[PDB]
């Protein structure tokens, strides 16, 4: 009859975990996810000692502990560095056919991010490097699209260009 008690007290935790898992991947905020997971773990810690002996409670506590442990990689997966190419690379390497618009937090959670941390680290490293190069090209585009040649009047005959040192220094850089 204590099986009914542990199942009834664990049902609410299961509903909240599933509701979090059903959230679309775009709307996930990892800090809010950590807050919700911490609330769930503290709620689990308050169960009667009789329920805690069961394997189901240990399994659910271990599951939330694993989600907390991979919350770091979840934060890294919300990085703006990742693009369509990097999502394709993750899908190919992890052998998962995700749909980026339709992706949910649960699908990433149940995929063994803990075991496959090396692949995730490699892909996000490549994403960081490519983001660095992309933002450098963005800086070039913005600077040269917004650069105006300064002009200073010369004896009321015309305006000659001033700032050769700055222009040549920027071009050389």
């Amino acid at each position: 009859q204590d099986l009914k008690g542990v199942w009834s007290e664990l049902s609410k935790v299961w509903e909240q975990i599933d509701q979090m898992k059903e959230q679309p991947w775009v709307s996930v905020q990892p800090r809010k996810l950590r807050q919700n997971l911490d609330a769930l773990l503290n709620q689990l810690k308050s169960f009667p000692a009789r329920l805690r002996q069961y394997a189901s409670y240990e399994f659910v506590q271990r599951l939330l502990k694993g989600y907390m442990k991979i919350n770091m990689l979840v934060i890294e997966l919300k990085s703006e560095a990742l693009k369509d190419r990097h999502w394709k690379q993750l899908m190919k390497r992890l052998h998962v056919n995700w749909v980026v618009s339709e992706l949910t937090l649960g699908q990433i959670w149940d995929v063994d991010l803990q075991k496959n941390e090396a692949i995730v680290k490699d892909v996000l490293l490549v994403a960081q490097g490519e983001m660095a190069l992309e933002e450098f090209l963005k800086q070039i585009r913005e600077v040269w699209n917004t650069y105006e040649l300064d002009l200073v009047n010369y004896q009321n005959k015309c305006r000659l260009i001033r700032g050769w040192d700055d222009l040549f220094n920027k071009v050389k850089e």
Binding site: G129, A132, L133, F136, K172, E173
Partner: protein
Amino acid sequence: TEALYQVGKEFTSKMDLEKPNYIVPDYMPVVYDKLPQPPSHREAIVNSCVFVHQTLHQANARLAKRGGRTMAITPRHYLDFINHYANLFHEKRSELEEQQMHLNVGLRKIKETVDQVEELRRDAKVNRSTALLKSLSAERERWEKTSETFKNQMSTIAGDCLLSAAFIAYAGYFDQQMRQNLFTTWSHHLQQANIQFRTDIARTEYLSNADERLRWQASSLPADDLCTENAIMLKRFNRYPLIIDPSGQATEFIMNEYKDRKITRTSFLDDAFRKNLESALRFGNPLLVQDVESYDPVLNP
């Protein structure tokens, strides 16, 4: 001492430094007066890890006493030492476990081959199978003893990594004589604490495979014990290195080693230094910066 002890324990807690048969010494030397008593293996190892920092501070003070050029010792040296100790302990334990697993697989295959030749003896090729079996079983026995040796290697790994980890972290500026003096002091302190470590340790050999040494000698590495130890320090570094090379061989060595990665030369005195540093940091190519006597502070972060 307490801060070093606590920051050591919580960084080396993930490591398996537990030995159920650690015979506590009758008289132990202690830097942390509040050590748990009788100390366990983890407690003794962390106390020795603090002994490394304390002895290095004493050595630097002694070098100042005799007029020698001293170098600042800071907590980051201790953090780098503990990080190197953890990485080295994990690497060596992983290597030994891989070798032991491969030898177990080899014993399985040797038993399989014994079964195959026994099947072939069920069938003048048959007579000489008595010789091949006489070889195979001997090889099997040999591999068995090899497996036994690996167990002893486990019992010796921890202290050995400590005596190497400190060497990678602390004694990089010192001369060869003081490097050996510090190593002997650390080894004596480890012996005093009953921590098991190899008696005749070769630092340059314990931290590098001969393929790497051959590759370094292929590059412009003057082949000496000090130069090999320095080359190791340029491989197992957590913090970026400062190469004091009046000869100039080490710069060429770094250049030849990282030529595949397209390393580029720069100096602080050069006018176009900051932009080259910006490019190297932005794109990830390795960099060598010369003339750090005029060290710019922009490189501090």
